[PDB]
A and B are shown apart, each in its own frame.
Chain A
Amino acid sequence: MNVLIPGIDGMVSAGTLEYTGCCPPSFADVDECTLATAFVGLLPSGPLWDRPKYEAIT
């Protein structure tokens, strides 16, 4: 007694696995504003890069 749904092998019963938590962020996540500002972090640090890195509005 478990409902039963369809499959390439007949009428198999189904279920649900537990949410692991891992799963790399996929295409939906990649965003322009979200990584344009992230790419500012690849720059060095110092009195030449600190204020420009702080005022970078997008």
Chain B
Amino acid sequence: DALSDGFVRLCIDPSLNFFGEGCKILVEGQMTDDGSATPDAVTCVTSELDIIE
């Protein structure tokens, strides 16, 4: 930002969850046909609100 005043310049990291990403847990199990995830391929899962879909 050019409009700022001081010189110490904060640059917030794009996303949170830094604390993790060192304790990856892999859940393996079956799925129905409603889901849109490709079978037999690991995929990250962010939150809970989009697992039914």
Contacts and interface: CB of A to CB of B under 8 A. Distances in A.
B4 interface: yes
Interface in B1-33: 1, 3-5, 10
Secondary structure class of chain A's binding surface, majority of residues = helix
How extensive is the interface on chain B, given as a class?
under 10
Interface residues of A, number: 5
A41 B4 CA distance: 16
Contacts of B3: 50-51, 54
Interface of B: 1, 3-5, 10
Interface of A: 45, 47, 50-51, 54
10 contacts: A45-B5, A47-B1, A47-B4, A47-B10, A50-B1, A50-B3, A50-B4, A51-B1, A51-B3, A54-B3
